[PDB]
Amino acid sequence: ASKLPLVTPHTQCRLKLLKLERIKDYLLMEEEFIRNQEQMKPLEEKQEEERSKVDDLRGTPMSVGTLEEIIDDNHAIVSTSVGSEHYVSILSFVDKDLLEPGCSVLLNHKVHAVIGVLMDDTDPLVTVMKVEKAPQETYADIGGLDNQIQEIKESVELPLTHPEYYEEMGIKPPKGVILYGPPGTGKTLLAKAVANQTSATFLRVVGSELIQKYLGDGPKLVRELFRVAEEHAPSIVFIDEIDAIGTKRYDSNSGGEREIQRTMLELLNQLDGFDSRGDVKVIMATNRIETLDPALIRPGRIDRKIEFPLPDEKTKKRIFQIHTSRMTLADDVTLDDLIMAKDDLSGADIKAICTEAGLMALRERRMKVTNEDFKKSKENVLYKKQEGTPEGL
Amino acid sequence: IDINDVTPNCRVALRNDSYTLHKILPNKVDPLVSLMMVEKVPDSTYEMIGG
Amino acid sequence: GSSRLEGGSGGDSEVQRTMLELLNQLDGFEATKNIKVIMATNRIDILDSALLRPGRIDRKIEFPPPNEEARLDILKIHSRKMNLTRGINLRKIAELMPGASGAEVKGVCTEAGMYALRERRVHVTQEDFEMAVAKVMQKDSEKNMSIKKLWK
Amino acid sequence: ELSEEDKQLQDELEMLVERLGEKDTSLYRPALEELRRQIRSSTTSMTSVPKPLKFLRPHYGKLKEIYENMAPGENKRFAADIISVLAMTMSGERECLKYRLVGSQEELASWGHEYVRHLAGEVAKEWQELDDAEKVQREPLLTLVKEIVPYNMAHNAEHEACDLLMEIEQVDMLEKDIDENAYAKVCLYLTSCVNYVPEPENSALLRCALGVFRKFSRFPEALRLALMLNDMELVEDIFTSCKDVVVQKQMAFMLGRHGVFLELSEDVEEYEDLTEIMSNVQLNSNFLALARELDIMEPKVPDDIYKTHLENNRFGGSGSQVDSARMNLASSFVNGFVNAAFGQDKLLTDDGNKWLYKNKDHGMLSAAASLGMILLWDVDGGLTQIDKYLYSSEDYIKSGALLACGIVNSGVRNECDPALALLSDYVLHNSNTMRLGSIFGLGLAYAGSNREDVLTLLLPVMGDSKSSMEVAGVTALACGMIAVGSCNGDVTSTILQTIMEKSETELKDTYARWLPLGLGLNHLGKGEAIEAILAALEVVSEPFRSFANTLVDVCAYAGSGNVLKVQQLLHICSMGAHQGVAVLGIALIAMGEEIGAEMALRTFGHLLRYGEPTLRRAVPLALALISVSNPRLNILDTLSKFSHDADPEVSYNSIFAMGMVGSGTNNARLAAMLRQLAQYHAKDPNNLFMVRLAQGLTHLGKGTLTLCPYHSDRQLMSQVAVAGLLTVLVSFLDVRNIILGKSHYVLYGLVAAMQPRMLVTFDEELRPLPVSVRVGQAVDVVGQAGKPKTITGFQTHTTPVLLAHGERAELATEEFLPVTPILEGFVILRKNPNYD
Amino acid sequence: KRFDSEKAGDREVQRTMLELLNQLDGFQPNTQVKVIAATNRVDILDPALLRSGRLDRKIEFPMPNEEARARIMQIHSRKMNVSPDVNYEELARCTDDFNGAQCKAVCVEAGMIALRRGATELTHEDYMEGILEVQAKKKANLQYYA
Amino acid sequence: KTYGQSTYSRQIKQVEDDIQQLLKKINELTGIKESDTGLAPPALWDLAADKQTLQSEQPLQVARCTKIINADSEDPKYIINVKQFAKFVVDLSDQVAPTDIEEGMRVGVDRNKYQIHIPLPPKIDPTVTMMQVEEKPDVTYSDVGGCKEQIEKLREVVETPLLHPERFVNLGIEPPKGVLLFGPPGTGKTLCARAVANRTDACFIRVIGSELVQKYVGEGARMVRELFEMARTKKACLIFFDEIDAIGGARFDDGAGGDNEVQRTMLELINQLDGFDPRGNIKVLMATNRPDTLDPALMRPGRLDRKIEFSLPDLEGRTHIFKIHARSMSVERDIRFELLARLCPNSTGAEIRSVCTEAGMFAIRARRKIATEKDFLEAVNKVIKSYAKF
Ligand SMILES: Nc1ncnc2c1ncn2[C@@H]1O[C@H](COP(=O)(O)OP(=O)(O)OP(=O)(O)O)[C@@H](O)[C@H]1O
Ligand SMILES: Nc1ncnc2c1ncn2[C@@H]1O[C@H](COP(=O)(O)OP(=O)(O)OP(=O)(O)O)[C@@H](O)[C@H]1O
Numbered sequence A: 001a002s003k004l005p006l007v008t009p010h011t012q013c014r015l016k017l018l019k020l021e022r023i024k025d026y027l028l029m030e031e032e033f034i035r036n037q038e039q040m041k042p043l044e045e046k047q048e049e050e051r052s053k054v055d056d057l058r059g060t061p062m063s064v065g066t067l068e069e070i071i072d073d074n075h076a077i078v079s080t081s082v083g084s085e086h087y088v089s090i091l092s093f094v095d096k097d098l099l100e101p102g103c104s105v106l107l108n109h110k111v112h113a114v115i116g117v118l119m120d121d122t123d124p125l126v127t128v129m130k131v132e133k134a135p136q137e138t139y140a141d142i143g144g145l146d147n148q149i150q151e152i153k154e155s156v157e158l159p160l161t162h163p164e165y166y167e168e169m170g171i172k173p174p175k176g177v178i179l180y181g182p183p184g185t186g187k188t189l190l191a192k193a194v195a196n197q198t199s200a201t202f203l204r205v206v207g208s209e210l211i212q213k214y215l216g217d218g219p220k221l222v223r224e225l226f227r228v229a230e231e232h233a234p235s236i237v238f239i240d241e242i243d244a245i246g247t248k249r250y251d252s253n254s255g256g257e258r259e260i261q262r263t264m265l266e267l268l269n270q271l272d273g274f275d276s277r278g279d280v281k282v283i284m285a286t287n288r289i290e291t292l293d294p295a296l297i298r299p300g301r302i303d304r305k306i307e308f309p310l311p312d313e314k315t316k317k318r319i320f321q322i323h324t325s326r327m328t329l330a331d332d333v334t335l336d337d338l339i340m341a342k343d344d345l346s347g348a349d350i351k352a353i354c355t356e357a358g359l360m361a362l363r364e365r366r367m368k369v370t371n372e373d374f375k376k377s378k379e380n381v382l383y384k385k386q387e388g389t390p391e392g393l
Numbered sequence B: 001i002d003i004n005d006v007t008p009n010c011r012v013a014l015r016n017d018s019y020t021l022h023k024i025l026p027n028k029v030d031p032l033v034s035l036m037m038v039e040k041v042p043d044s045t046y047e048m049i050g051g
Numbered sequence C: 001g002s003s004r005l006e007g008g009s010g011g012d013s014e015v016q017r018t019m020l021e022l023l024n025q026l027d028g029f030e031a032t033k034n035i036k037v038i039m040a041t042n043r044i045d046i047l048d049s050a051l052l053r054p055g056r057i058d059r060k061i062e063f064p065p066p067n068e069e070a071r072l073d074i075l076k077i078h079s080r081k082m083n084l085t086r087g088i089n090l091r092k093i094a095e096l097m098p099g100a101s102g103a104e105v106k107g108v109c110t111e112a113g114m115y116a117l118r119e120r121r122v123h124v125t126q127e128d129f130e131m132a133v134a135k136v137m138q139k140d141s142e143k144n145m146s147i148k149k150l151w152k
Numbered sequence D: 001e002l003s004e005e006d007k008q009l010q011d012e013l014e015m016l017v018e019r020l021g022e023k024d025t026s027l028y029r030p031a032l033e034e035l036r037r038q039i040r041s042s043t044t045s046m047t048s049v050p051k052p053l054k055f056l057r058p059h060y061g062k063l064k065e066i067y068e069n070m071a072p073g074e075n076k077r078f079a080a081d082i083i084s085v086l087a088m089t090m091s092g093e094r095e096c097l098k099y100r101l102v103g104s105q106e107e108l109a110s111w112g113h114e115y116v117r118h119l120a121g122e123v124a125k126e127w128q129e130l131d132d133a134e135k136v137q138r139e140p141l142l143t144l145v146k147e148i149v150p151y152n153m154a155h156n157a158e159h160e161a162c163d164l165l166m167e168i169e170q171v172d173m174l175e176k177d178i179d180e181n182a183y184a185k186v187c188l189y190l191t192s193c194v195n196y197v198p199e200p201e202n203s204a205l206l207r208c209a210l211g212v213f214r215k216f217s218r219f220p221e222a223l224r225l226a227l228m229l230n231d232m233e234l235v236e237d238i239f240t241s242c243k244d245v246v247v248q249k250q251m252a253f254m255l256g257r258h259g260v261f262l263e264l265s266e267d268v269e270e271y272e273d274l275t276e277i278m279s280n281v282q283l284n285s286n287f288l289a290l291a292r293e294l295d296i297m298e299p300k301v302p303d304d305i306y307k308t309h310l311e312n313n314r315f316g317g318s319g320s321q322v323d324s325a326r327m328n329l330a331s332s333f334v335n336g337f338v339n340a341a342f343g344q345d346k347l348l349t350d351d352g353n354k355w356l357y358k359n360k361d362h363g364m365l366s367a368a369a370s371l372g373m374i375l376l377w378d379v380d381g382g383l384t385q386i387d388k389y390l391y392s393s394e395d396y397i398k399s400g401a402l403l404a405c406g407i408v409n410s411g412v413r414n415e416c417d418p419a420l421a422l423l424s425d426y427v428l429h430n431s432n433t434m435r436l437g438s439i440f441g442l443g444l445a446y447a448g449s450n451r452e453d454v455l456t457l458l459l460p461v462m463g464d465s466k467s468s469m470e471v472a473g474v475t476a477l478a479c480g481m482i483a484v485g486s487c488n489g490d491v492t493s494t495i496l497q498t499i500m501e502k503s504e505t506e507l508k509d510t511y512a513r514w515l516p517l518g519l520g521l522n523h524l525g526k527g528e529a530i531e532a533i534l535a536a537l538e539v540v541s542e543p544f545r546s547f548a549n550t551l552v553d554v555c556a557y558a559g560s561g562n563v564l565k566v567q568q569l570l571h572i573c574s575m576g577a578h579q580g581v582a583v584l585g586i587a588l589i590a591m592g593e594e595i596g597a598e599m600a601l602r603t604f605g606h607l608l609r610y611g612e613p614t615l616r617r618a619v620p621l622a623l624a625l626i627s628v629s630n631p632r633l634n635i636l637d638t639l640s641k642f643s644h645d646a647d648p649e650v651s652y653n654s655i656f657a658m659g660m661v662g663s664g665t666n667n668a669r670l671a672a673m674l675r676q677l678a679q680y681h682a683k684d685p686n687n688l689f690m691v692r693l694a695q696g697l698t699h700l701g702k703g704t705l706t707l708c709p710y711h712s713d714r715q716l717m718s719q720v721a722v723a724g725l726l727t728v729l730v731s732f733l734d735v736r737n738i739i740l741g742k743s744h745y746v747l748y749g750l751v752a753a754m755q756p757r758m759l760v761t762f763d764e765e766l767r768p769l770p771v772s773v774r775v776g777q778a779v780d781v782v783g784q785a786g787k788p789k790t791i792t793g794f795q796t797h798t799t800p801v802l803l804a805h806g807e808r809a810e811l812a813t814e815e816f817l818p819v820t821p822i823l824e825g826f827v828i829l830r831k832n833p834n835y836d
Numbered sequence E: 001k002r003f004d005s006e007k008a009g010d011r012e013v014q015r016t017m018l019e020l021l022n023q024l025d026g027f028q029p030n031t032q033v034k035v036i037a038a039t040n041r042v043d044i045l046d047p048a049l050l051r052s053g054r055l056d057r058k059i060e061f062p063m064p065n066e067e068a069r070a071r072i073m074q075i076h077s078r079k080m081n082v083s084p085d086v087n088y089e090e091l092a093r094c095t096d097d098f099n100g101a102q103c104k105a106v107c108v109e110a111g112m113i114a115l116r117r118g119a120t121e122l123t124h125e126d127y128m129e130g131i132l133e134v135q136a137k138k139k140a141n142l143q144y145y146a
Numbered sequence F: 001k002t003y004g005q006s007t008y009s010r011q012i013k014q015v016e017d018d019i020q021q022l023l024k025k026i027n028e029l030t031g032i033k034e035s036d037t038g039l040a041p042p043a044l045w046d047l048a049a050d051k052q053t054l055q056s057e058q059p060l061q062v063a064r065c066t067k068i069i070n071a072d073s074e075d076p077k078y079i080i081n082v083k084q085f086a087k088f089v090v091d092l093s094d095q096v097a098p099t100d101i102e103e104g105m106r107v108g109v110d111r112n113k114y115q116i117h118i119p120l121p122p123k124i125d126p127t128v129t130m131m132q133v134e135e136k137p138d139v140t141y142s143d144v145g146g147c148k149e150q151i152e153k154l155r156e157v158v159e160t161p162l163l164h165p166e167r168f169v170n171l172g173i174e175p176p177k178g179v180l181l182f183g184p185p186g187t188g189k190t191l192c193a194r195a196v197a198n199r200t201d202a203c204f205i206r207v208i209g210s211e212l213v214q215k216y217v218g219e220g221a222r223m224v225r226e227l228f229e230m231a232r233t234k235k236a237c238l239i240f241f242d243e244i245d246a247i248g249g250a251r252f253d254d255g256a257g258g259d260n261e262v263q264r265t266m267l268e269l270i271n272q273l274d275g276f277d278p279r280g281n282i283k284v285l286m287a288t289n290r291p292d293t294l295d296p297a298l299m300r301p302g303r304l305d306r307k308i309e310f311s312l313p314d315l316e317g318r319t320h321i322f323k324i325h326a327r328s329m330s331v332e333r334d335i336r337f338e339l340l341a342r343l344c345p346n347s348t349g350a351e352i353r354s355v356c357t358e359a360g361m362f363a364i365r366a367r368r369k370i371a372t373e374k375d376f377l378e379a380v381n382k383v384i385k386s387y388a389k390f
């Protein structure tokens, strides 16, 4: 509560202890004196009747205007609802920490002098982007990464948990992490996990959702997205499928691609530009990364870059037992027989196989899922490969 | 007036010199969702939708 | 709907607030509640994808235009609450209406009733139905060829 | 899986509980060596209790048994060590220190920082528990700490190194291995932790820092520390030891600033220049150099400060009729303040007799002394100008001239004693006003010099018959200010004698409050050394006794921040006017560390919200004292609130306080507030007077003068300045009758604390040499890895810049290398050899 | 130019253009106000605006020729203290394809370089270094040309 | 428990905990209940419960904002347009002198006879006042290394002429007023701009090119015009356009209209810079990764007079940058920073700062508190080699 900063080494030390013991001891003297005074006299009556004088000054028909410019000197220009513009005096009881242009101010009826402010809605965009807890699962449902999860934890979680480590040595955390790899490999899932596990406000956006059909709306959207992230303490932003917005930036192009490039420039400035980004982190994903712009994924914008390989032989077993976890299976399930094949299966492919097998098991009324069903489902899912066989090989 | 009955989104009559809520005028609910229940949807089966 | 940030509103458009409330309500209740929300559309592609997520309305069903049996069935159901004469052969009426749609078979009913009314009677006749279906299908083909000419 | 494999590997030895016990030698060395390799190995991520340490937990008892009493050659040593390593998780007894006390003496670095820190903590605890009787048991501990400290220095861990070598109280050993690369950090921290620490330990820490700052031939910093300690002999050793002449110039400037003097022998090279510098004689030349460079010479008349035309002239005609005597006295004060030390003045110099004759009675006194204020620091021509007003018809004008000579001589030590030469005539004269002017000027003309001739002239008067309580009080003040911190016995003796000489009725007079002030003002800085006096004052009347005791207690522990005295005064508060001095003391004790000052602001806010009227009319002055020339927003708001107050005493005190807090700042916000505030109490004579005085103080000088007692990084506490501040503030405790009455000349007691705010850089030859200097707020860099930047919010100006409170100036370029690392006041520069 | 496109917005500019067209030469003849204009592209202006009644006299401004380049340089360097050795014919010849707004760069940058080298009066080499500055040319890491 | 972070961890934890408890206890013992009506701390209902509010409500009437439109005759007679209220022909109250009022300035008038009492500052789009810097960055010219000629030119064009006008005015040189900074991504453009903003002593404005595209036609030009009017009110100001390629696109109109409004805003900026209306004391900077796309009219002297090329730093600058960024570290004593400079081939400033931070990382993960050489070698490996293919 607006307490003093010790500004000793800030790391466990004897000076941090003595500057700390001192504030505690002063608070102790203050508390003792206050308790003595309260016992000696309640002062409830005196503290009261100040509310009465205030409410006397602010008449009953208080008017909700809209502040529009503070002259910096206990004066203001407050606009009444109709649209008129008055130049009123700011009184002494208004908490000035709450006065910024555009705030719904509470004016006097006969004199329009500012006498209070009101709260506003919390959903410019906060609700629509924040994801809350991930319905899928926690870190439990993710297996096989181990190293990647460790990287992300150090990049985004560890700087929140124990700042002392980074602080001790004078190095700030990395700026942003870009998750890149073949489709269906665990990018969005790991971001979801590090979101639902940490203690900041995690915001998610799709790149195609920044392609706007009015000019100068994409840049506005990105500017806002990075505007309500410093209003909210530590924050994380994850711009998924960025490829749809950040591309190689070929100049020989016509149409709305120019607007795409212009929003890309706005983002490129937000991440690392003139001003200090405050306390926010940026995660990104891209199935295809060779096509990003050099200035977006350059070192000071995205320090960490993470590859995401497919499950090889055993992570396949882990994922399979993760998705088959909740289903009654017959005692003939030759799971390895399904895994041993070097079919280059992907994680999303494993989920598809599990769901399809479960669904046909439901179709046949059978209380349990059989190995034959899983193999048939595997054949069916892989059926969505196509392409020209001899060609290219 | 006991404030418990001054719900949000309710019409009220305010006085002239010093606006003072001093009535709770009625409201029109206008149920728009209670006009489409069909019960069991009689005469609507798989049989007369042959094909 | 069709998106949550479409016109640059910032999620404050009414069309988007209704969708947000619908999403909140759909995520309100559990799968085991015997409350299934059937949703329909005449244009799938435009339809938003935030509805088709896991934990929401995923399963979809295609709908080809109805066949002869389906056409006859739909005509039967839509004419159900009309006065008819005897010996009315709806199968024949369908035969005289190949490659029609639901709205066409809905229009043929009202047209035929109104013609019967001009005849100054309480009942619709098979001859009246034939003439109505001829008119409705002729205007349908006229609309189709007008669209083709506009394309030309 | 990996878990199964690692568990099986750990079991490979865990199952063989006596693997070393088996007679076969193939399991003696290799197994224990492999275990040491595995445990000592590091892991990834945080991994609290790394996998080896976690895995060896259940194998704890057998781990001890295998050691027990086996062969002492190597197996026992290694087993003891590994037990010490795993002796961390259990978190029980001192098995770590016990087993490292008896085990292989392998290099600690092989174990890591974590264990070394834990073993350092255990060693500190054990030494604390260990009685001094077990001297032999301490030699292993001292070996361990001698090994530990270098590991802490080479691994950039100086703060904990000082901490550990403090817990075992051996802070004199730092010298023997400190090395160059890591001495700045250790001295910085060791000082920083020296005000918050109890009494006997603080001196030892300061000795250590001074010893090191010598060891590395860093002399001006050592002088800073020695004065801090307030030891004059160490100051001799520091000054004389140095052979470098320019460095001696620099020490001279610092010393002259402090207002402390050192009397060189006549054989020191260039003696005349050292003495000239240490006299602050040239200070006027530099002041006028700065004033010319900034082009701020033009005199400002009081109206320019008033800017009345801006305010809405609703009563431009027959407005409120305020007192003419009071308005013209205030105008004289503001004219003296605004032009102070610049020499010239549009009002007086052009025609001063008319302005003086606009004033009335005692206003002639303060009005004339305003002229001495105006020529301050200009002894040479000050007397040439003031000569006319010295010889006048009105006694008040003559005494004004006297107080003016006292002001002009102030702060600058001339060998010709014009002040003592002139003010000698009348000190015993009959006219109490003449005596008062003479004595106040003379005390302001030497305060802190501790001149024995002055003392042996002045001391009788407090015992004279023709000495009214005002004269007795003024005399006690003069002695206190001329014997600051000198523990001088004569002043104390005479003060006590006069204090016990007076009947109860006399003690009730407010001018008797000026005896305890003298007594406490003699002894500044010496806490716990006054208990004799506290016994000497136990024989005063109950109210006056409480007043004198409390006052001397607070005047003893100035610049301490002793929390126990804070608590005792607070206990007192929760009655007479004792409590007013208690309130002032709450701030006087805590005028040091920033932590103290802010927490005291909070305590004062609470004391105003809830409190009795006597409390309330003293909080403003303590708020003013706690922040002088430091107009912080919160003090300004919480003071302006009580300015527009029904309680008139509170109003006067708050208005004076807000005038001070802004002393010599030229704040636009504050000037606007005071203009509005004059608008409000336009019909109130006293409040309007306080307002006019505050408008002068805010524009003291023209932003080139600051009363703040502290200087040299807010660390060195000035005695003359604090003396003047106490003199002025205590008077206001009965503001109404003294200041808003016949006694306003006390307002010149601020002259003791007037210094400049310049930064004028000289070369080795004492010539101006402008250099680009970054100017901005300070940053504390205690125990921060590397050499992190030490300024924020910085703007790059040229050399002769004005440093407001908390503004630290650095050099923009490595072109010049300064002598003293405190780029404040006057500094010298030398060329860096390796500039490119 | 106007055109038939389904994209809106441009129509409003076209419409204020129609209004300007009408103001120049239309009903209610105006014979007291005259108009000027300037364009880098005349290939995109509407024929009804280049028409021979609204915008009658059209004037071309060519990239200055050698004599013009010397004249421009001389005009702009008139204030600076230049030495009596600069051959403005040379400086004109080594300034091919230099639009008039370019000596300003050359004249001024020559003064700037004179300041850099702590000079007082300009000399031919100062102007040459100015020219090499204004052209703004990059090297290819090698000079294989003979 | 844990491994044990520090010997005092538990003691500081305890003092913090009881600090929180004593703060909560005083909070309860003092009230201070949050008020939904925006009302100050009761100790700060101060002059507010009374004694200034009651003294400010009496003498300080409500003036009403009005926009003067004309000042006819020498005799004071002013046509003002009160917004959404009415339009009047009023006179001057005594407080304002006739010189203070001009046409087009917002003025305050009373509610009874509508006579003018106070002028007021003009109205500026909220989105055009934030681009002022307000708090200046701390980066300085020692933090930028390996770029010495470039920084010299920038300082001689944007910085030196303002500080010391007489040098240039004597000899008779009007200094260049624009700079185009171009070079590979992450070479030092925006940092040198930050340094210029920190050192300079005049108004500074940051405009992003992507901040001047607007939905409604003819808005961006208004924004630029307002920005230059504002910057021209000040005594001197610097504007630093970033990613100016955002709106400086080349003109290629053909067939169906494409990106034409951006072209109008670009023309408006062109005319503001160098054109009929004199440009006062303003200096402009621009930064682009792609300078070729900028149109032939902007890139011309008179608008962008200088062109500073930023090239990847040489070996000496490489070590210098390494050493600047490795300053506030807890690092070992002897590191052959020349070795580290050699070991990384052509690489930009961002590479090097990433190297420093990755070395700090490899120090942390090894649970060490002082950075050594091996840490930096591991850092260089993990930065250059591993992230080569991007
Ligand atoms: N190792 C894994 N553990 C658990 N689930 C996994 C794993 N790998 C893939 N999945 C499954 O992949 C599904 C797809 O979501 P995911 O977040 O992994 O996509 P993605 O890799 O970001 O895809 P895209 O590249 O298309 O953006 C998740 O529902 C999860 O069930
Ligand atoms: N010469 C340098 N000295 C110190 N740091 C540098 C240097 N060059 C680059 N950097 C680092 O590079 C980081 C990237 O920001 P910088 O301002 O250099 O980018 P930029 O060159 O403007 O890039 P862009 O072309 O993407 O706008 C800066 O934060 C700074 O830390």
Ligand SMILES: [Mg+2]
Residues within 6 Å of the ligand: A182, A183, A184, A185, A186, A187, A188, A287
């Ligand atoms: Mg993916």
